[PDB]
Design goal:
129 residues, mainly alpha, Lysozyme, 6% strand, binds chloride ion, binds sodium ion, hydrolase, monomeric
Length: 129
């Protein structure tokens, strides 16, 4: 599923991400835009052999099991394919664990390079929330 901007904002808000660990909703929407272009089915292979999955490009090296990343962990305790569903619940719960682990949203390279320090509220402007 390819979400619309406000559709995704509303789904993320319902799942508890607005101001989660101090990150306003616009941060999460911005991160999703530049990580996946709002596409739940996005995958990208990394040089170390891990793969990023889903709307928030969650990495198989630490967070989910895809059966092809030797020596990796599965800290969200999910198959990585669960992160590609049109239902973002799995991705959101896993993202909550990630953002709590210490480095906050810096875990997402696109957020660090393209959202951090910008007017992120613009990503939810106009939406009925
Ligand atoms: Cl915001
Ligand atoms: Cl772009
Ligand atoms: Cl594996
Ligand atoms: Cl933080
Ligand atoms: Na893994």
């Amino acid at each position: 599923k390819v979400f619309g901007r406000c559709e995704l904002a509303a789904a993320m808000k319902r799942h508890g991400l607005d101001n989660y660990r101090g990150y306003s909703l616009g941060n999460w929407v911005c991160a999703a835009k530049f990580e996946s272009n709002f596409n739940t089915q996005a995958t990208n292979r990394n040089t170390d052999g891990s793969t990023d999955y889903g709307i928030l490009q969650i990495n198989s090296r630490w967070w989910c099991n895809d059966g092809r990343t030797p020596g990796s962990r599965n800290l969200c305790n999910i198959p990585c394919s669960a992160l590609l569903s049109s239902d973002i619940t799995a991705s959101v719960n896993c993202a909550k664990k990630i953002v709590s682990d210490g480095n906050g949203m810096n875990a997402w390279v696109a957020w660090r390079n393209r959202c951090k320090g910008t007017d992120v509220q613009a990503w939810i402007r106009g939406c009925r929330l």
